[PDB]
Structure formats: structure tokens, C-alpha cells
From a paper:
BA.2.86, a recently described sublineage of SARS-CoV-2 Omicron, contains many mutations in the spike gene. The characteristic spikes on the surface of coronaviruses are formed by trimers of S, linked to the virion through transmembrane helices at the C terminus. S is made up of an N-terminal S1 domain, responsible for attachment to the host receptor angiotensin converting enzyme 2 (ACE2),2 and a C-terminal S2 domain, which through conformational rearrangement executes fusion of host and viral membranes, allowing entry of viral RNA into the host cell cytoplasm, initiating the infectious cycle. The RBD is positioned at the top of S and can adopt a range of conformational states, from a fully exposed “up” conformation, able to interact with ACE2, to a more hidden “down” conformation.
Numbering used by the authors:
A (entry chain A): 313 to 592
B (entry chain H): 1 to 128
C (entry chain L): 1 to 107
């Protein structure tokens, strides 16, 4: 067999951040934007506690692409983008990477490389009128499909055929937007659903959002498990002589393996050396 | 500037008919719902009816006391809204306002059933 | 139709005072409630939309809150130009009904 050294301690180094991310105002909002003009909010420089997310209704969908919900408290993303809107029931399947349809093409398109989470919950008791909730509209006609995360709020009359419209609707000249008719008596596939899309991006720049993972003391010259801003690994941390430029955070080897890391708190450089190992 | 000039108000005998007009300017009349609201002398506001935009089907809703007597019409050509009332009684006297339900297509948070802009109001009196 | 009641209907206060107007609906109307201000001899003006959103051009001293069957309009610091009649209007149903009307006067 092959002998290896086993770790003795586990250390976590997270940024010294106290503020709590404003997920309550994103989720417990009085109104949600229309799908064609979905509301985008930037979340950064705060501690993101997702353990409270489930505290807003019995989630109908919590599909996470690239990560898992149970692990969301152990990661350190860089920027969070929260896009909130309202759609219908059967249309909720269109909010996913590599999808097609009315919402995917003309309202909200998710890139194929999407990494994040999608939340949808039924909101028939909030966004339905017995006479019809006409506050929510979706685009029905466009020249071409949308680029990922592109918002189209134009309301110009759509010209389909060769006949000019001159700004007057009618045959061959349809109004681009069509309004939802949410009612309390509609079917589940037609009832309103509130959708919040979180778009994480990892690595690169220093992480500004992090989970509620406590940071322990930093120990060097020992074979330990380490977790630097979501970067997990095993090895021995040692002082570095590297000319790490101020912006540079971590260094890579020939095999693109993290070999030097900048401590998120002390802003000091640490070389990572794999624990002694070999064959017998 | 958004303006809603009204005309056609006046006095009428019981059982008569008048044709109120409300000409809109300064905004896209096509995309805005138009509602009629009346205020009895010394009383609170009462809702008369509503006509939706042509892009939403143009269905017309009326209050219970005025369902079978009033008729709300619109013409996008001259950006004008019309309220036709017939078979009046002594209880229909009030100051009638024409109101709009402009929808903000840009921001996204645009209400559709809020009286954003109001006309100056015209006085309609029913007497012998 | 939905029965809609205001409370109170004769409240008065002086300048630099806090005023709260309560508006109760006969059934759950979610957030479809609007607050209007009518000065004597003038057309009404929209103040609060969706029962929690300030309208553009309205001073920040007007605030809306509540949901379900209870709504409240709060004026933090009353002003000489804030004496008027306030109406709460529901849009949950197709038959829109206004409130009873609250008159805010001076002492």
C-alpha cells in the first residue's frame, strides 16, 4: 500500500464580515416585478444565511444548478444577483438553462453555464384578483431571442409583415406585451407563481458573500485540513516569499492546483504543501 | 404635461341623457385605462365604471347602481373618453371625474388599477 | 361588492403631529388598496399605491403599511397643507369601492 500522513486539525478562514444579507427584502416584498422587466438586485459584502430561505412558504421549486442547497452555507461566492418576477404555473419549467418558450426567448433567458439556484412558490393568495390581476405582463413578440440576463422594456409596436404600422396596432401589427389574467379560480398551471433566481459566481476576485461558517485560529507547520473562503483542501501551510501583487489572491501550479493562498483576514500569503506521502 | 379636459356637463330633466367627454393629452391614451368617478355633493367618492385599453380587450365594468343605465365608450383616434348616461333619476347628481390608470412599462412595478391622473371634474345636475 | 370602512372620520391634529388613519376591508384584499387626498374644492390626488408604495411627487412624510384586512396611513409630521379628506380605495374586486372618507382638520 501507500502511506500518508493524516490531518490533526481543521481550520476555516472566512472574511471578518458582520452584516447580514438583505434576503428578507428580496423575498418578503409587497410586490414583484413583471417578468418582462424582472427586478435585479446586487447582493455583496454580507453574510448570506440561507437557512432562513425556507421560512418563506412551502417552496414549490428550489432547483440549484452547479451547487446543492444543503451545502449553500459552506460556500463563499463573490457576487450574488437576485432576479425576482412573477410567472404562471406551467411556465415555471422555462426558468432553467437551455430552455425555450415565451419566457426563455422574449422575457428571461438563463445562460447555458448557469450556476446558482431557482426558487418558485405559489402566490395565488397574494397576486390574484377576482376581476383579474393585470399588473403582470409578458412579452409575446420580438425580432430575436434574448441574450442571457438581458432585459427588454421596449414597448414599440411589433411589425411582423412588410406593411408598416405607423405606430398603430391592428392586423399584422401586434402589441409586444400581453398581460396575465390571474384569478383565484384559475388552475394550478395558470395561477401566479413568484420566482426568485440567485446567480452566484465563484473564485476570481475576493469573495464578498459567505455562509455563517465560524473562522478558527490559523495554525502553520502542521498537516491540517483548511478551508479558505470555500477553498477546501489538506496540507501544511507555511510562510511565503512570493511577490503576491495586492490584487492577487491565490496562486496555481503547472497542474492548476492551488499552491499559494492569501489569508482572508490577515492578508498574508501561505504556501500549501501536500502532507508527506509515498509508497511502502 | 398630462391634461384631461372635460366637457358636456350640465343640468337635465329627470329621464334625460347627457354625453360627457374627457379629452386626454400629454400621455399615450391607447395604453391607459380610463375610469369614471363621481362625488355626490357633500359625500364621499363613488366609482361609476371602467373601460380597459384596446390591448386588454376593452371590456367595460360598471357599478351596481349604474350597470343598466350608463355606457362608457372611448376613441383612441382623438384621445377622448365618453360616458353616456340615460334614464336618470334624482340621485345621479354629482361631480364626475375622468381618471386614468397609466401603466409604467419601464420600471416594471406598474399598477393597473390606480387613478394616476384626474380630470378637473364637471358638474351634472338632475332636476325638474 | 366589498364592504369597506374607515376609522376614524373626524380626527384632527395640530402642526407637527402624528396622524394614523385605519382602513378595514370586509375580506382579504392582499395589497390592492390605494390612498387618495382630496382638498376642499379640488380633484383628489393619489398618495399611496398598493397600500405600501409612495407615489412620485408625494412628500416622504406619508407612509403606508398593512396587508390582509387592516391597512394604515401614517403622517409623521403634520403640516398646514396636510389638512384634507383622505380616502382608501380597494381594487381587489372588479367592482371598485371607495372608503367612507376621513376629514383631518385643525384645532
Amino acid at each position: 500500500s501507500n502511506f500518508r500522513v493524516q490531518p490533526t486539525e481543521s481550520i476555516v478562514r472566512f472574511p471578518n464580515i458582520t452584516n447580514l444579507c438583505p434576503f428578507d427584502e428580496v423575498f418578503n416584498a409587497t410586490r414583484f416585478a413583471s417578468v418582462y422587466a424582472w427586478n435585479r438586485k446586487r447582493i455583496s459584502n454580507c453574510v448570506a444565511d440561507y437557512s432562513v430561505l425556507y421560512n418563506f412558504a412551502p417552496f414549490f421549486a428550489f432547483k440549484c444548478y452547479g451547487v446543492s442547497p444543503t451545502k449553500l452555507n459552506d460556500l463563499c461566492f463573490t457576487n450574488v444577483y437576485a432576479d425576482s418576477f412573477v410567472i404562471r404555473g406551467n411556465e415555471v419549467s422555462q426558468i432553467a438553462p437551455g430552455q425555450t418558450g415565451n419566457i426563455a426567448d422574449y422575457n428571461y433567458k438563463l445562460p447555458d453555464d448557469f450556476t446558482g439556484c431557482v426558487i418558485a412558490w405559489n402566490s395565488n393568495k397574494l397576486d390574484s384578483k377576482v376581476g383579474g390581476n393585470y399588473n403582470y405582463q409578458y412579452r409575446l413578440f420580438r425580432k430575436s431571442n434574448l441574450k442571457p440576463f438581458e432585459r427588454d422594456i421596449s414597448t414599440e409596436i411589433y411589425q411582423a409583415g412588410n406593411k408598416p404600422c405607423n405606430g398603430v396596432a391592428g392586423f399584422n401589427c401586434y402589441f409586444p406585451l400581453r398581460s396575465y389574467g390571474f384569478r383565484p379560480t384559475y388552475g394550478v398551471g395558470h395561477q401566479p407563481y413568484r420566482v426568485v433566481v440567485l446567480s452566484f459566481e465563484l473564485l476570481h476576485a475576493p469573495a464578498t458573500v459567505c455562509g455563517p461558517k465560524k473562522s478558527t485560529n490559523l495554525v502553520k507547520n502542521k498537516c491540517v485540513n483548511f478551508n479558505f473562503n470555500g477553498l477546501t483542501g489538506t496540507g501544511v501551510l507555511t510562510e511565503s516569499n512570493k511577490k503576491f501583487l495586492p490584487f492577487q489572491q491565490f496562486g496555481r501550479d503547472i497542474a492548476d492546483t492551488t499552491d499559494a493562498v492569501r489569508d482572508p483576514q490577515t492578508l498574508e500569503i501561505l504556501d500549501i504543501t501536500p502532507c508527506s506521502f509515498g509508497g511502502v | 404635461e398630462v391634461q384631461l379636459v372635460q366637457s358636456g356637463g350640465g343640468l337635465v330633466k329627470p329621464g334625460g341623457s347627457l354625453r360627457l367627454s374627457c379629452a386626454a393629452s400629454g400621455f399615450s391614451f391607447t395604453n391607459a385605462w380610463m375610469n369614471w368617478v363621481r362625488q355626490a355633493p357633500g359625500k364621499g367618492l363613488e366609482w361609476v365604471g371602467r373601460i380597459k385599453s384596446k390591448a386588454d380587450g376593452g371590456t367595460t365594468d360598471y357599478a351596481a347602481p349604474v350597470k343598466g343605465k350608463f355606457t362608457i365608450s372611448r376613441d383612441d383616434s382623438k384621445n377622448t373618453l365618453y360616458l353616456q348616461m340615460n334614464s336618470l333619476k334624482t340621485e345621479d347628481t354629482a361631480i364626475y371625474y375622468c381618471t386614468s390608470d397609466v401603466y409604467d412599462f419601464s420600471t416594471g412595478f406598474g399598477q393597473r388599477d390606480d387613478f394616476d391622473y384626474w380630470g378637473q371634474g364637471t358638474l351634472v345636475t338632475v332636476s325638474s | 361588492d366589498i364592504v369597506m370602512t374607515q376609522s376614524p372620520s373626524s380626527l384632527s391634529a395640530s402642526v407637527g403631529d402624528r396622524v394614523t388613519i385605519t382602513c378595514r376591508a370586509s375580506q382579504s384584499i392582499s395589497y390592492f388598496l390605494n390612498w387618495y387626498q382630496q382638498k376642499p374644492g379640488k380633484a383628489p390626488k393619489l398618495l399611496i399605491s398598493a397600500a405600501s408604495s409612495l407615489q412620485s411627487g408625494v412628500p416622504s412624510r406619508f407612509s403606508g403599511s398593512g396587508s390582509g384586512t387592516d391597512f394604515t396611513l401614517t403622517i409623521s409630521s403634520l403640516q398646514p397643507e396636510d389638512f384634507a379628506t383622505y380616502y382608501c380605495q380597494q381594487s381587489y374586486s372588479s367592482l371598485i369601492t371607495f372608503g367612507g372618507g376621513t376629514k383631518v382638520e385643525i384645532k
